[model samples]
Target chain A: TDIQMTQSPSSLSASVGDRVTITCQASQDINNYLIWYQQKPGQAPKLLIYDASTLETGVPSRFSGSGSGTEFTFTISSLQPEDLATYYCQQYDNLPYTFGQGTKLEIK
Target chain B: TDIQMTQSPSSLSASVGDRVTITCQASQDINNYLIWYQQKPGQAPKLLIYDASTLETGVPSRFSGSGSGTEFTFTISSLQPEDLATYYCQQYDNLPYTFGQGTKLEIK
Candidate 1:
C-alpha cells in the first residue's frame, strides 16, 4: 500500500494562549523523511518543518516537530492568532510522496 | 535562500474538451525541481508530478509535466471536471524550499 499520512483531529478550535498539537502517522516506516506545511486561505503552502524535527528558516521558534519512523508530531506552543491555518504532513520516503488530509486550525 | 517560484495565469477557465496548461518560473535554477501538487476546495494537496516531468503513481496519464532548470509546465490533456483545482509548483533544491502562488483551474 502507499505510504499515506494520517493526521489526527481533522480540525481544531483554540484560543491564543492555548497549546496546539497535530500528529501524523505514516502507513509504513518512513524514518525521518517527513515535512510539514502551513497554508492560509488564498495562499500557497509554506514549508515549516523538514526531516521531521528541523524548522525551516525564519519560522518562529514556537513551531516544532518531533518523532521518527512512522509517527510524527507538529506542535505550536502559545498559539497566536496568526497561526490559524491548515497544517499538513508529508512523507518523502516512498515513491509518489503523499500528504496528510490536513488539519484546519481556527482561532476562537 | 530565495528560490521563489512564480506560476502564471493565476486562474484559468476551460471546457471539458480543451487542454489546459500552467507554467511556473523559478527565480533561480533548481534543476529538475522536486514536485507539483493539486488541491481542491477543503482538501489537502495531492502530488501530481515529481522531478519535473515524472507523473506520480496513480496520477492520470492525461496529467503531464515538462521543462527543467528555471521554467516548468504542467498540462492536462482533454480536461476533465475533476481537473478543476489549484495547481502548485514546488522547488526543494534550495534552502527554505518555496512554492508558486498557484494556478486555479476552473470549468467553463
Candidate 2:
C-alpha cells in the first residue's frame, strides 16, 4: 500500500502579493517522481512540476519546487489574482498515484 | 502546444452496465503519450490509462482502453454507480500536455 501525507490546514493569506508553500510526503522512496498542479473553477488542473524540480512546459516561473526521495515542496514566489486557485501535489512513484488534499489560496 | 478534445459533452449509464468515452487530438501522431483520468468531487484526478494502453495499478478490471495517435477510447466494462463523474483524456506528447474538455457520466 502507498500513502502520501499532505500538510493540512489550508493557507489563507494574500489577495495578490503573498507567498505560499505546500508540502507532501511519500510513505516510501519516490525518487524524483512528483508533480504539482493548479486547478481553477470550470478549468482542468494544469501541471506545474514534474520529476521533482522540472517545471512543466508553459508553467509560469513564479511557481517553483524542490525535493526528492520522500518529501517535496511547491512554492509560489509571488501570488497573483490568477494564481488564487487550488494547488495540489502528486506522486507517480506508486500505484494509484495520489494527490495532496489541496491548498486553497484565498484572499486575506 | 498540444490540444485535445473529448467527444460527447456528457454520458449517462447504469450500475453493472457499460460506458465509453472518446478523445481526439488536434494533430496526428501524438505518439503513445496520452493518458486518461477519472475525477471525483473533492478529489484529485486519478490516472486510469497511461502511455495509451497501460492501466494504473488497482484501477479495477472493469475499466479498459484502446486507441492511438489522434483518437482513443476509454470503456468501462461494468458501470457501477460509483463510476459517475467526469472523465478526461490528456496528451503529453507535447509541452504542457492538455486535457480534453471532459465527459460527465451520470446515472440513467
Candidate 3:
C-alpha cells in the first residue's frame, strides 16, 4: 500500500516572524527516507530535507524537519516574505517513489 | 549530488503532434534511482516512470521512458488533453537527491 499524505487541509495564513509547522505523513516505515520540498509559484519544487531531518545546504536555519517511520513534520521558524510557497513531502523508501499532495502556505 | 540536466527542457508549446520528448542527463550514473513526474496546477507531481524506463502502475500507456548511463528520456505519445502539465526528472542516487528544473508543456 503506497500512500503519502501532506496536509494543512486549507491554506494557512501566518504573520511575519511567526513560526509555522507543516506536516507530511507516509504509509509504512519510511526508514528515514522522508524528504521535504518547497515550491514557489512558477517554479519547480526545491529540496529542503533529506534522510528525514537534515536540512539541505543553503536553506536558512529557520527551517527544520524531524520525525520517524510513518510520521514526519516540517517546521518553518520566523516565516519570511520569501517563504511564501506550497510545501511537499516525498518518500523514497519504495519503488516508483511518491509525494504528498501539498500544503499551501500564505502570508496573512 | 546527481545533477539532472534537461536537454530540451521547459515550455514545449505544441498540440496534436507526434511523440513529445524530453531528455535529462545526470552528472553521474543513477540507473534505478531515476524517476519521472507530471505536475499540474496546485497539485503534487504524479509518478510516471521509475528506474528510468519502467512505467508505474495506473500510468497511461501513451507515456513512457527510456535511458541509462547518465542520460534518460521521457516520451509522450499522442499527447492528450489531460497530458498538459510540467514534466520533471529527479535523481535519487545522490545523497541530497535532486530534481530537474521541470519542463513545462503548453498545448498549442
Candidate 4:
C-alpha cells in the first residue's frame, strides 16, 4: 500500500513572480518509481520523470526536484508568467498507484 | 537522489464538467522515463504511457509531451468535454517513490 501526503491543506497563492514548493510521502519502499507533472487551466496532465532522476525530454530547466525513500520534494527554481499553474507527484511503487494532494501556484 | 511529489496542496474545485491541470517532479538518475494519466471525478484512473516523447499505443493523439533532464512535461493538446478530469505525472525512476498529488478537473 502507498500513502501520500501534501505539505499544506490549500493551494499556495503566488503572483506572476513567486516560488512554490510541494512535498509528498510514501508508506513503504517505493524504490525508483517516482515522477512529477504540471497542469494548467484546461489541459491534460504531462510526464515529468521516469526511472527517477532523469528528466523526460523537452522540459524547461527551471523546474527541479530532489529527495528519495518515503519522502520527496519538487521545486520551481524561478517562477515565470507561464508557470502560474498547479503541480503534483505520483508513485508507482505499488498497485493502486497514488498521488499527492497538490499545490496551487497562483499569482497574488 | 530521486524524490518526487505534487505541487498542489488541494484539488481545484470544479463544476460537474470542467478541465483541470497538474504537475510533478523527479529527483535524479531518470532517463526518458515517464507516463501521464487522467482520473475522472471518481474513477480508477487511466494510463497514458510512453518513453517521454512516444505516446502509448491507444492514447488519443490529442495527448502530447516534452521535456528532459531533471524536468519533463505533458500536454493534453486538446480538451474534450469528457476530458474534464484530474491529471497526474509519474516516473520509472529508481523506485521507492512515485506520483505527485493531483489536479482536479472541475466543472465551473
Best by TM-score: 1
Count of clashes, each model: 0, 0, 0, 71
Task: Residues B3-95, candidate 3: write the lDDT tens digits.
Answer: 655545767787865689998888777765788899987688999988888888889899898888788888998888888888888887776
State in Å the error of residue A67, model 2: 1.8
Comparison by lDDT, 3 against 4, better one: 3
lDDT of 1: 0.89
Local distance difference test scores for all models: 0.89, 0.73, 0.82, 0.60
> Who is ahead in lDDT, 2 or 4?
2
Quote the positional error of residue B83 for candidate 1 in Å. Answer: 1.2
**Candidate 2 chain B minimal-lDDT segment of 10 residues:** B1-10
Tell me the spans in candidate 2 whose CA falls farther than 4 Å from its real position: A1-14, A56-58, A92-98, B1-18, B92-95
After TM-score superposition, the amount by which residue A15's alpha carbon in candidate 3 deviates from its true location, in angstroms, is: 1.4
How well is each residue in A21-106 modelled by candidate 1, as lDDT tens digits?
99999989999999999999989999999999998778899999999998799999999988989999988777677889999999
TM-scores of the models, in the given order? Answer: 0.94, 0.77, 0.93, 0.51
Sort by lDDT, top down from the best:
1, 3, 2, 4
Candidate 1 regions exceeding 4 Å error are none
* lDDT for each residue of candidate 4 in B17-105, tens digit (9 for 90 to 100): 23233445566646766666677643334666545567654767767766664566665544566666676665655443355566665
A64 Cα displacement, candidate 2 (Å)? 1.8
User: How good is the docking of model 1, by CAPRI class?
Assistant: high
Q: Candidate 4 — which residues are off by over 4 angstroms? A: A2-9, B1-108
All candidates in order of DockQ, best leading: 1, 3, 2, 4
